[PDB]
Design a binder for this molecule. Structure first.
Ligand SMILES: N[C@H](CCC(=O)O)C(=O)O
Ligand SMILES: N[C@H](CCC(=O)O)C(=O)O
Ligand SMILES: [K+]
Ligand SMILES: [K+]
Lengths: 266, 265
């Protein structure tokens, strides 16, 4: 396992929030990332379709020596995490359960909100994951379909972002919650807006931050942590390479290695 | 219908902070706790002695159907975690690694402080654990030998507690850290005093809170979570039963089931 990498898959660029947290909290691990930008968004797609696309990305990642797989996309995790964990022998870490687990840790009232794409919310995976750990939690799940697009295409228009965040969170402002799970790869970029809308009494949970610590926990439990003092990461996209590189530099603050890929493989 | 329990061992009553977090974050799991109050404290004891006492507690807990073992005592974990993980087939979760992992998650500057007993600090297990994950972290480790006794015997004397926390943390106020790991079972009981001494720029991590989520992560990864909607927990002590019951009631806010036990079994 000394040369093995962490495979990371996502529907596009959003997953860079997850990749950044793995790079920060597990600095000796090597990332091999694939974003299916050509078919993004997955949010409005059927479960069957999303599962087929995710398995195509897994086939691509299998060309590398994987020690573990992270499904960075909440929509993809909702639709295929169980299928992947059954199919693969390596650890498969999704972004939903780590967020639910962290919500249980920070809630004082046992009342949790979660926002995400229509696919993520309709799967009801967040409520199911939360109840598996604690049946006596009240979970309010709300789809916010306009947010990911807002993050990728209108983020500089602050007035527009504020209005869209206000509209998306109106249903939750009416509910009694003290914790909110950002159940979508893109939402960390809206954290400030969200906090302003919900208030100081609601603790925000990032899927990215919690998934990296969950991965860390599992790799160490399994005794497979890397010891590389200066790893390098590789990013792949099915869409425009220049487009991905540009957003990435904006989100990360630096340039990354990006290459094109065609799915299905071979 | 899976009847296995989570074994929890500690040097005494301090481990109730860890037990309370497991009960809160994993409400379907059943706890079987043993505190070696008759030989507490472990902090000033030799590593060989602590290892021997911990293995006696494990022999006691093995009488129950254990699905996992939590070493709630930071001093005991420092001295015996490796030995336990090698000797047992069930998952053994100590309180040190979860704290280090959480510190990496919250630090922005990569400068972490940790406090604990002399035994915990002398083992240097915190620095080793932190560096295993990230070699480029600066770790400041300081023993605070008087704090656990302060928590057990002088907590109502606020002027005294403030003075003892001030003296214990003086060396860390001189260091540049943005995160502090409470590397002892008793320190959550001093969180307010510690926050006041270090300021709002230092995020304080609880070993109990992080160990419970680490346990949760591992039980679910292994597919062994309980589904019990109303479990019951049992506590055992090698010291005075009435004394344990009294402190427990003060710390938890309610009474618990406590029985006496003799080690070695
Ligand atoms: N990455 C998706 C957001 C984008 C999409 O709809 O594909 C998610 O985390 O749910
Ligand atoms: N339980 C110990 C504190 C008490 C003792 O010294 O035994 C620890 O967490 O380090
Ligand atoms: K393509
Ligand atoms: K004194």
């Amino acid at each position: 396992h000394k040369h093995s990498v962490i495979g990371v898959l996502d529907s596009g660029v959003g997953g860079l929030t997850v990749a950044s947290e793995i790079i920060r909290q597990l600095p000796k691990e090597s990332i091999c990332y694939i974003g299916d930008n050509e078919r993004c968004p997955y949010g409005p797609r059927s479960v069957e379709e999303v599962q087929s696309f995710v398995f195509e990305m897994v086939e691509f990642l299998k060309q590398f020596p994987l020690k573990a797989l992270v499904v960075a996309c909440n929509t993809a995790a909702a639709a295929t995490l169980a299928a992947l964990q059954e199919a693969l022998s390596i650890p498969v870490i999704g972004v939903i359960h780590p967020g639910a687990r962290a919500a249980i840790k920070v809630t004082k009232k046992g009342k949790i909100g979660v926002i995400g794409t229509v696919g993520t919310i309709q799967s009801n995976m967040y409520e199911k994951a939360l109840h598996e750990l604690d049946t006596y939690l009240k979970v309010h799940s709300h789809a916010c379909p306009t947010l990911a697009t807002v993050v990728e295409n209108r983020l500089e228009d602050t007035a527009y972002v504020t209005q869209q965040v206000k509209q998306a969170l109106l249903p939750l402002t009416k509910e009694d919650i003290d914790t909110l799970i950002l159940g979508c790869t893109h939402y960390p970029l809206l954290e400030s807006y969200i906090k302003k809308e919900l208030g100081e009494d609601v603790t925000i949970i990032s899927s990215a931050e919690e998934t990296a610590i969950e991965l860390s926990t599992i790799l160490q439990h399994k005794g497979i942590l890397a010891d590389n003092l200066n790893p390098k990461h590789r990013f792949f996209t099915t869409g425009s390479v220049s487009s991905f590189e540009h957003i990435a530099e904006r989100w990360l603050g630096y340039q990354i290695s990006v290459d094109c890929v065609d799915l299905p493989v071979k």
